[PDB]
Amino acid sequence: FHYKNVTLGVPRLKELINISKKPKTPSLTVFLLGQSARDAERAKDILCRLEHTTLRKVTANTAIYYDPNPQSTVVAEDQEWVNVYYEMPDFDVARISPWLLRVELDRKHMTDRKLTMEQIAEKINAGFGDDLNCIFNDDNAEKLVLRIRIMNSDENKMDDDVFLRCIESNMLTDMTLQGIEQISKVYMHLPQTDNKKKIIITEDGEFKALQEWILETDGVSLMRVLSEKDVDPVRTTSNDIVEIFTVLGIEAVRKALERELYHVISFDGSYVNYRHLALLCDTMTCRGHLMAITRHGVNRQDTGPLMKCSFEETVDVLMEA
Amino acid sequence: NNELEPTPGNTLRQTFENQVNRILNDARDKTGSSAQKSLSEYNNFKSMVVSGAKGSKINISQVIAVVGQQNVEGKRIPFGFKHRTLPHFIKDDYGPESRGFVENSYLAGLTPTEFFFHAMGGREGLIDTAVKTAETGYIQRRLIKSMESVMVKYDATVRNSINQVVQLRYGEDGLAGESVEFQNLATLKPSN
Amino acid sequence: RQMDIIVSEVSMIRDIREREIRIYTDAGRICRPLLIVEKQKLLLKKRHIDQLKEREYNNYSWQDLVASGVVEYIDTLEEETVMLAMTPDDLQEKEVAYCSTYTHCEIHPSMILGVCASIIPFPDHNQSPRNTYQSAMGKQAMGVYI
């Protein structure tokens, strides 16, 4: 209770002793290579480039109107920029569908992520199909509005009120503007201890510690993060050992597992010798895969029948044997 | 007055209680130092804390200066009624008195609305010791059944019960952990 | 208060924001007595004390103290619409006013302890697990039992 959110003590020990596929708080420490590792704003748009941004995080309200012709505009102000569009109207080939969708945008969450309506409207048109039409304002105005119409080439059952509310409540939750979908929140800090700094042999031959910007997430997907530019592919790690077993190998789970046991033992200032952590991590990963220390890891081994019966499944082991 | 800007990673509640816990936690270690520098040489608390037989430096501060601040579920004492902690205070009160800062000591005694809070904190610290022993005593059985026959053979190899090899030399060097010490190499560190 | 229709064990909770009134006559509730405060003064005058130290030959007791409207039973739900003053001599004076509209007052704030915790001298000086240790250890101290 007293110390982000990282599990320690007993529950992280019983997360490492078995191989629980959902650890209670996984993370992914992210190092940086070039100019992004020293300046704060380029670290800020690496931060924006990793964290997942769904569309409903940058919306104000959605209001379904009824304009049968785009020259009516019951909305009391929007005749100006659709009149700019009315100087040269485009895509009136089949009909005009009357049912409209209208999204207002919030510029704090928009300019926080260096987004604009041109790449949002690029994403929600190129990526969904051509079933919609996405018109929007100029960046001179204060309010950010984008009008959406359904494609007329079907009107030349599928009632479009239920359909248009269905894509309204599907584009709010399943649009993925930026980021990786497994990673929900990424922090940003530069360390004070020397175990997350960059240690360089200088020209004279001296160990120097350098402060670097590091990012650290809430959610793990390692293979997409290693494959991203301005990310150090050598030093990026995590704490989900089945995900390192998916991505890196088996020796990396030996060594990352040894590092995780050493991380939970040495948080209260204690000290256990190294022969014991090497023997446990070298027995747990000896036959190729993650032999979890439970019923289902040891009771599926080539040990005899009279050893498995003193561990939790006596009569079933005796009757299969 | 709607003038408190949040911090990166926190809500408004979290930046509020983090800086209030910052102020109050920085003002009970000061009283702790005022208690530590005001003892004597013939004292017996100090003659036990120094010698290392029993005691610690927070017990001298709680006995002499300030007991501290209690907390259940890892945060400051919660609104167990609606908008109050006990029915003596006023609704939506967030001060240090209303939510558990015990500003007296063990020798000046405790007020009632403060002895109740200290009973809450001591209760939580008693539940954790009451519960933890079953989980730890279950882990320590499951490991010892999973590893029980790994041993060192007459080849200095560390083999299983089925003789399938775990390590080629014990501890990756070949030595027993009874007779080793801390040393320093003193070749890696200095300049060229 | 003065016992016309309603037996003294009911509870009458009014939450103003929720806009409803709950009245409980059900059995099983737990409650404790308190002293009524008027405008700012108590209702337990000295006229109620000088004829209460005379119980052996006056026929005046706790039921005449309830039936006079100076104490009152309050339970747990009704202790969320209440405004207690923990002691009259220090919390109902004219000072820098914390609250000015108290509606009740406790008898003595050391009546929150049980039977085995009322045999500990100075419990406000001890660490509270030690109070929990002796509140389960004066149950096996050899003495005279009956």
């Binding site: - | 816990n21 109050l24 936690n25 927070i58 709680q62 501290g68 601040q69 400051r76 | -």
Partner: peptide
């Protein structure tokens, strides 16, 4: 019983 960083 001490503080948030200590013990209860």
């Amino acid at each position: 019983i001490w503080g948030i960083g200590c013990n209860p």
